[PDB]
């Protein structure tokens, strides 16, 4: 009977200046009220200038451009930079160094849990932290009053190191080595790699209509188009939950969609800007 409607997670990440790039984040952590301060964190390819915070509105804005760019593919029938305000507190240090005082730095957020602080730093900072080098980490933990207003979506103004681009698409670690995404991104002004694209697409599991029938497949359609779909016939040749991702060789732009797909890899889609 009844009808659903998703609570997932937003992504547009755009180049504004020569050397400036804002990324907003909208995610359903920040949908919730009051269980007490809670936390995100996740990688951006260089130092955050501010974190703005835009309207509530800004959310299913940004999610149309590639539910759109995917909709016709179907066939249906080294400091730590601290931002503080009001209701939420964030902070830009180095994974090196989010490391090294990760826990020091959660208090100052005025987290100061004990199990989670444990929880955290171990499933979800050993994601966050590498080898080649070290990329920022966005550590931000929205408080209570958060929940009050019409303007709980944010920005971060920020500019990339060398020339990259992450989109924070890797989770926590968890113990069933599955990952299960749900997730739309505008990502412009970054070079296709059809390389990281393929082997991110191809490790996917859509979802099933119980049509046994039903066939997932592939697709790498060179603007390039590297996703999967569930196709079935009903006369009717549907071709539904195409996710995966397109790439405007004009605009030079990216729509990824990984919504309710679930997949062995976790990690971030790193990118170079032109």
């Known amino acids: 009977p ?29 949908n919730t009220q009051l269980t007490k301060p809670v936390l995100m964190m996740f990688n951006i390819s260089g130092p ?62 005025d987290y100061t849990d004990k199990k989670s602080i444990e929880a955290y730093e171990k499933y979800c900072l050993p994601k966050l932290v590498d080898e080649r080098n070290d990329y920022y980490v966005a550590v931000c933990v929205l408080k209570p009053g958060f929940e009050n207003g019409s303007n709980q979506v944010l ?38 790699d059809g390389e990281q694209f393929e082997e991110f697409v191809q490790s996917l599991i859509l ?9 997932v497949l592939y697709y790498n359609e060179a603007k390039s188009m590297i996703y999967k779909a569930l196709e079935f016939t009903t006369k009717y040749n549907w071709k539904i939950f195409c996710n995966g991702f397109i790439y405007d060789k004009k605009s030079k732009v990216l729509y990824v969609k990984l919504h ?13 800007t032109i």
């Open 48 to 109: 955050i200038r501010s974190v703005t915070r835009k309207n509530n509105n800004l959310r299913d804005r940004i999610k149309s451009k590639p539910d759109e760019q995917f909709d016709q593919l179907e066939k249906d029938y080294d400091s730590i930079k601290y931002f503080k305000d009001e209701h939420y507190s964030v902070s830009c240090q180095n994974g090196s160094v989010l490391k090294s005082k990760f826990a020091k730095i959660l208090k100052s957020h």
């Open 260 to 272: 309710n797909v679930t997949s062995a890899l976790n990690k971030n889609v790193i990118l170079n």
């Open 2 to 30: 009844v009808e659903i409607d998703v609570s997932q997670t937003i992504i547009r990440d755009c180049q504004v200046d020569k050397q400036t790039r804002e990324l907003v984040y909208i995610n359903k952590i920040m």
């Open 155 to 192: 920005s971060f103004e920020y500019n990339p190191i060398g020339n990259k681009v992450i989109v924070p698409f890797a989770h926590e670690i968890n113990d069933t080595g599955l990952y299960e995404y749900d997730v739309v991104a505008y990502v412009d002004s970054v070079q296709f």
């Open 207 to 215: 979802p099933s209509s119980f049509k046994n029938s039903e066939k």
